[PDB]
Paper text:
Milano is a contractile tail bacteriophage that infects the pathogenic plant bacterium Agrobacterium tumefaciens, an important tool that is widely used in genetic manipulations of plants. The contractile tail of Agrobacterium tumefaciens bacteriophage Milano is flexible and bent to varying degrees, which sets it apart from other contractile tail-like systems. A contractile sheath and rigid tube assembly is a widespread apparatus used by bacteriophages, tailocins, and the bacterial type VI secretion system to penetrate cell membranes. In this mechanism, contraction of an external sheath powers the motion of an inner tube through the membrane.
To explore the fate of sheath disulfide bonds upon contraction, we solved the atomic structure of the contracted sheath. The structures of the sheath subunit in the contracted and extended states are similar and can be superimposed with an RMSD of 0.7 Å between 347 pruned Cα atoms out of a total of 491 Cα atoms with an RMSD of 3.9 Å. The larger all-atom RMSD arises from the different relative orientations of the linker arms invading the neighboring subunits’ SHD. The rearrangement of sheath subunits upon contraction resembles that found in other CISs (roughly, each subunit rotates and moves radially), and the integrity of the two-dimensional mesh created by the sheath linker arms is preserved. Upon full contraction, the Milano sheath subunit rotates by ~12° and moves by ~13 Å radially. Two of the three disulfide bonds that crosslink sheath subunits to each other are retained in the contracted sheath (Cys14SHD–Cys244SBD and Cys216SBD–Cys327SBD) whereas the Cys47SBD–Cys182SED bond is broken. This suggests that the disulfide bond Cys47SBD–Cys182SED needs to be released to allow for the rotation and radial movement of sheath subunits during contraction. We could induce contraction by a mixture of guanidine hydrochloride (3M) and dithiothreitol (DTT, 5 mM), a reducing agent. In the contracted (post-attachment) state, the tails were straight.
Residue numbers in the entry:
A (entry chain D): 2 to 501
B (entry chain D): 281 to 501
C (entry chain D): 2 to 56
D (entry chain D): 281 to 392
E (entry chain D): 57 to 224
F (entry chain D): 169 to 224
The structure:
């Protein structure tokens, strides 16, 4: 041995038990993967970093791109889990036809916003280039991560979705070069965008109880527009918020792209989903915006559950970039109608005709919850902050109450002697009240009357005579959580007169 | 059925933790992630939770100690099982009369501790000659009377409130000492035999805390 | 489940029963409507805001 | 006749509330929005009040437990029915002698 | 123990929802009459839907209500299939779809099945807009018949007292 | 001996990559049989008290 340790007078132990890393940001991104991927479908798998995305979940798949956005959004998250899904057996891949007609007579630049700003192409067309050469150039310039395999044929670019299903039906190629003053589009060249076939049969897994059995997830991101699949995820997260079994909470993030009538019809009373209302003319691939929103919400949960993912600072999906326009997607009438019916509305950070790229930010960070079990329009779970913070409060109160586990419980008159691992309902209630008062300004607001808001009863004073069981307690806590903060109606009243 | 750890290892850890509590705090319940954590055992984490909560409730209902992972995850670490409930397999009386006297392992451990402590206290009256309950034993005489015996027993019991019992509804009517003369028929009871009845309240285990959170969002209601 | 909730020692319920909105101002406005409207005549209907009045 | 809820559900809630009182307070009358509120049952609100008040008075007169919605509205929420009167179907003696000994369900529970 | 969606199952579910944590609830299950006839209701749906919307239905109690999303162009068959798939299994009426007609057959024979009230609680709603097209109609094509008449309480409940007897 | 559970806790791991090829399978070709039934506690543990008895 080593001197001073050989005589056994000093016995030394290292104990590396403090320095174990916490999980982090438990976000489960679910989406279809292409057959190029090495991941096993229908199995929740940890995704360490952005490196293995293409290898594991397919090159250019829906899950690959949504995971890329989740990794771009949060700080340095590695606890991103994924749930790859297989394409439906009879699924049909959407096919778009970007047909180009020429020939070009003058030089110029041909810029195209396909999908997101990460996939935009910017080619240089010279004079006399036929439509075939321009289509070949655009195909060669299409990013491989674009979830659409591009093939050129005599000037028609066929973009076939990498994933079968309706998820391919939301491609918006914008020829963001027309009328530009700086980048002059070539004379001749005409870009036209058609969608020759539509997506079809989608996955409907409905296996969350088996795949995600008790492995809790703060945020579930669904990268499918299928309302049946969204409904299955909703039912799963609703089961996760159930008094019947031990709740290990979560919150789902789905999108609903369509006309105002269609979006509103796709909604229900789901406090478990934060439905993201997207207009029909939404340029960005919807699951990318949904993934950014869910990733931002998760990356907040890890830090500040009371935060509302909302506004240009806290709800800014900076990874997403869509071209600026004067036509504002949802008109303000539609915005008010959507926010009224529990829909998360997202809008451009800046409006302009200069044709820059803008990052969408979330207008309201709400769940799709409007009304109680009596339909009794209620406000308990209107905010996504409310779900996140009710989960945080329940978990914090449970972890505090776990300190009374194992302690033997005396009557509320007994003065437990020192050295005895014990407590009585009076000491329990005192410690609970001190805990709650310790979380004022962190997890609750103040307390109207902390004595009458927190009550602890034994099972003997709740159940009938000789029916209550010993060691069972009933704790009622009427707390006031922070509210989201929806609108500030400012009424400016200029005063110009001095003698009135 | 799908329990990964060799079962006798978890059983031995549980029994060793219970013993290692007995030596210190008999009133302790080997239960929860702090006091009933079998830290020596380590099983791989899984999302499939062994017993489903329906089976957990059915087992805890029928006097079974249920044990569960300390943490649930899909990251595939190792987790130490902790004991959900520290109960014995006792549900019902000799009349089958579903009863709660020995439901907790704490109850058996603590009834043993209480019996032994009361016996070791009562051993101090062994050898003492017993006078009638009116005699005022002179000093230097190794003696006692049922009145002094009952007074010392009541003082002992009141000394163990908060250590071995809870408080006493009525310590005068909970602890009674009778001679064998006022229990047996006339001229049938034997001298020097006593009957002590003690109706105490032991600490209970503490099984569940039904917390009912009620968020209040309105200011004018 | 979730740690501290898996052992069933703490059973938790949320109870969103306090935070239900009151009706408000119960005023019934009765009057003739034109045939352009989509409302069913002779039926008391809630009017949420000024937006759907014309419709 | 126009009762929306399956009737045996409301009957079971009423009987369960009465039992769950017996265990505690036999003198309690399962009646009103606090003590006779069948909170498990939820029926849609309507302006047509099931029994009209004439029928309500006629039923309560002839020893019938009448139950009504906790709230009336046209907003179409769900409301929990509560018991108007907690009475037995007892009106008259063995001489038919209209009597009041066992008119209340509280009276039967409390005589027991 | 008492069947999935039976009358006794649902009444017991309400008894357990009502009282605090009662376990001394006793039950007295009864068999359907030999010649008992199950009530049959026909919720007939006509379309197709032309606009999207929500179709909400209060069948039985609020525990059994359905709330489906109908999209534009959904035929009556798809809407009936959706409503059937959304009908809770505890609902005491087995639901089968057939070309847009939902046949709800009582799980228990007897007159006890004759008290189903399906309310299309979505018509005229300002918040949940019912789809254009879709028409819900509720008919009861057959009535319940012969009921149990046990008359065996003296033997079944001989001296085992019961504070409350609930008859479903 | 009938309660052995070998888990190939390496499948699908992101950090420790299991080799391609290798397949681990676990079968239990025979079952345990006749057990000890001592029933001699009165003689072996006559009055030597024991706070905890652990049965393996």
């Amino acid at each position: 041995a080593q001197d001073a340790l050989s005589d056994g007078f000093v016995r030394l132990c290292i104990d590396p038990s403090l320095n174990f890393f916490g999980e982090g940001c438990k976000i489960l991104v679910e989406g279809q993967m292409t057959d190029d991927g090495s991941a096993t479908p229908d199995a929740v798998t940890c995704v360490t970093s952005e490196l293995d995305i293409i290898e594991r979940f397919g090159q250019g798949s829906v899950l690959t791109e949504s995971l890329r956005k989740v990794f771009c959004t949060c700080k340095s998250g590695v606890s991103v889990y994924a749930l790859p899904r297989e394409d439906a057996a009879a699924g049909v891949k959407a096919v778009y036809t970007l047909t180009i007609a020429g020939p070009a007579t003058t030089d110029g630049r041909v810029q195209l916003y396909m999908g997101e700003a990460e996939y935009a192409v910017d080619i240089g067309v010279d004079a006399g280039d036929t439509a075939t050469d321009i289509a070949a150039a655009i195909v060669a310039a299409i990013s491989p991560d674009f979830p659409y395999a591009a093939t050129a044929a005599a000037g028609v670019i066929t973009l076939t979705a990498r994933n079968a299903g309706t998820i391919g039906n939301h491609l918006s190629v914008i020829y963001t070069n027309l009328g530009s003053c700086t980048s002059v589009t070539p004379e001749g060249v005409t870009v036209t965008f058609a969608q020759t076939t539509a997506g079809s049969v989608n996955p409907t897994p409905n296996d969350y109880a088996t795949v995600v059995n008790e492995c809790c997830f703060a945020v579930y991101v669904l990268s499918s527009d299928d309302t049946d699949w969204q409904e299955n995820l909703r039912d799963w997260i609703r089961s996760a918020w159930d008094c019947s079994k031990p709740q290990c909470f979560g919150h789902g993030y789905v999108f609903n792209k369509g006309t105002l009538g269609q979006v509103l019809a796709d909604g229900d009373n789901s406090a478990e989903l934060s439905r993201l209302a997207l207009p029909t003319t939404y340029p960005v691939l919807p699951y990318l915006t949904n993934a950014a929103y869910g990733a931002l919400s998760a990356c907040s949960t890890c830090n500040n559950p009371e935060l509302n993912i909302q506004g240009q600072t806290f709800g800014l999906l900076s990874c997403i970039n869509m071209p600026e326009s004067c036509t504002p997607g949802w008109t303000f009438g539609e915005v008010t109608q959507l926010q009224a019916n529990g829909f998360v509305v997202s809008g451009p950070s800046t409006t302009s005709g200069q044709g820059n790229y803008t990052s969408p930010y979330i207008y309201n960070d709400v769940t799709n919850y409007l009304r109680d079990e009596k339909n009794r329009p209620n406000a308990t779970f209107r905010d996504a902050s409310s779900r996140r913070l009710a989960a945080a409060t329940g978990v914090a109160l449970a972890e505090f109450l776990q300190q009374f586990n194992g302690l033997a419980v005396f009557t509320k008159n007994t003065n437990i002697r020192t050295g005895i691992i014990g407590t009585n309902p009076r000491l329990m209630l005192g410690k609970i009240r001190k805990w709650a008062q310790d979380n004022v300004g962190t997890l609750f607001s103040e307390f109207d009357n902390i004595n009458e808001d927190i009550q602890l009863l034994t099972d003997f004073e709740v159940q009938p005579k000789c029916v209550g069981q010993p060691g069972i307690f009933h704790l009622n806590m009427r707390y006031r959580p922070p509210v989201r903060g929806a609108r500030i109606n400012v009424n400016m009243a200029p005063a110009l007169f001095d003698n009135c």
